[PDB]
Paper text:
In humans, there are 13 cytosolic sulfotransferases that catalyze the transfer of a sulfuryl group (SO3) from the donor cofactor 3´-phosphate 5´-phosphosulfate (PAPS) to acceptor substrates, including xenobiotics, fatty acids, neurotransmitters, and steroids. Sulfation of 17β-estradiol (E2) by human estrogen sulfotransferase (SULT1E1) results in loss of binding to the estrogen receptor as well as increased availability for renal excretion, thereby effectively regulating the concentration of E2. To understand the binding and inhibition of estrogen sulfotransferase by BFRs, we obtained crystal structures of SULT1E1 in complex with the product cofactor PAP and three different compounds bound at the active site: the natural substrate (E2), a BFR (TBBPA), and a human BFR metabolite (3-OH-BDE-47) at resolutions of 1.95 Å, 2.0 Å, and 2.05 Å, respectively. SULT1E1 crystallizes with two molecules in the asymmetric unit (designated molecule A and molecule B) representing the proposed physiological dimer.
The crystal structure of human SULT1E1 with PAP and E2 bound to the active site is similar in overall fold and substrate binding as previously determined for the mouse estrogen sulfotransferase. In brief, E2 binds to a mostly buried hydrophobic pocket, with the sulfuryl acceptor hydroxyl of E2 within hydrogen bonding distance to the proposed catalytic base His107 and Lys105, placing it in proper position for catalysis. Also contributing to the positioning are Phe80 and Phe141, which flank the planar faces of the phenolic ring of E2. Phe80 and Phe141 have been suggested to function as a steric gate conferring substrate specificity for the enzyme. The crystal structures of E2 bound to estrogen sulfotransferases (mouse and human) do not reveal such an allosteric site.
Author numbering: 2 to 293
The structure:
């Protein structure tokens, strides 16, 4: 029944569990044609995609806030593999888009369309500690259409540890992108670093994107992309979406925006179980995360 629910909502593509709506048109994703100046923003879901996207968009627009608010973020920065009737078609939206394109994806690097690798496109990868990701993803299941009932948080965390959620194992995702992040064309970032010292990360992003980091530009980005601003900005908070797609009365997209909400969700027993499993999955990696 829970399992039946998951069966109805998700199916695999290249071994990765995926939203069924996306899979139907996966040939369009597979065959997607990149352009050399495309920039990819890749993340495991609920890792701060929207946050870094808006930072990047600001950098592209030299901090012109009006330009950033002209259309909603999912139109400004198309969601590559996404496909929903009329509202979203990432491939279509990207095809018609003038360059320079910013491309959002949640794909593991093994599933990124070959054209992006072939054209040597720059990629920004952002990750977030798994426990906080799990919390954020849980509420996402609750409030967004296309998800099964996630049950209780402990039940959901069991599915998360097994990678039985859309986009698959968080563990394999971050580890694979960490290996890619050694390339000079791939910038590897942490949500917790953006929380701790936003100015440092913004400046890093500006240099990676080969633009000039003035104090005024950096200050405009920092306040424009702060959680309190983005929460109330209808271009970035997904509130233009109808309730039957995202029911933000249940849980808002811009939910809390902190590091450490896991502490308010994991029980002592669940934390012990998770931590032990995590160490087994991650011990052979030089990738290290902070949970506070
Ligand atoms: N400007 C910002 N500052 C801090 N966190 C942000 C943010 N914009 C979005 N987030 C957080 O990033 C998560 C959404 O990620 P994504 O864009 O990849 O779907 C949510 O986490 P929480 O549910 O823990 O609040 C959301 O609150
Ligand atoms: C496309 C949907 C709305 C947008 C949703 C979204 C929106 C943003 C994001 O980063 C991930 C996802 C995954 C699930 C998507 C949903 C699955 C069905 C629904 O129509
Ligand atoms: Na790199």
């Amino acid at each position: 029944n829970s399992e039946l629910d998951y069966y109805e909502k998700f199916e695999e593509v290249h071994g990765i569990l995926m939203y069924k709506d996306f899979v139907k048109y996966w040939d369009n994703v597979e065959a997607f044609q990149a352009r050399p100046d495309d920039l990819v923003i890749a993340t495991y879901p609920k890792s701060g995609t929207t946050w870094v996207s808006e930072i990047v968009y600001m950098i592209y627009k030299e901090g012109d806030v009006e330009k950033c608010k002209e259309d909603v973020i999912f139109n400004r920065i198309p969601f590559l593999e996404c496909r929903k009737e009329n509202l979203m078609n990432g491939v279509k939206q990207l095809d018609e888009m003038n360059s320079p394109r910013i491309v959002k994806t949640h794909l593991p690097p093994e599933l990124l369309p070959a054209s992006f690798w072939e054209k040597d496109c720059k990629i920004i990868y952002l990750c977030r500690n798994a426990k906080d990701v799990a919390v954020s993803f849980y509420y996402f299941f609750l409030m967004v259409a296309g998800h099964p009932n996630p049950g209780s948080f402990p039940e959901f965390v069991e599915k998360f540890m097994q990678g039985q959620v859309p986009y698959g194992s968080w563990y394999k995702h971050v580890k694979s992108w960490w290996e890619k992040g050694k390339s000079p064309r791939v910038l590897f970032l942490f949500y917790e670093d953006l929380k701790e010292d936003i100015r440092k990360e913004v400046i890093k992003l500006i240099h990676f994107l080969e633009r000039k980091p003035s104090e005024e530009l950096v200050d405009r980005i920092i306040h424009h992309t702060s959680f309190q601003e983005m929460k109330n900005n209808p271009s970035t908070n997904y509130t233009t979406l109808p309730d039957e797609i995202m029911n933000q009365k249940l849980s808002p997209f811009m939910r809390k925006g902190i590091t450490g909400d896991w502490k308010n969700h994991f029980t002592e027993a669940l934390n012990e179980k998770f931590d032990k499993h995590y160490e087994q999955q991650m011990k052979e990696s030089t990738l290290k995360f902070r949970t506070e």
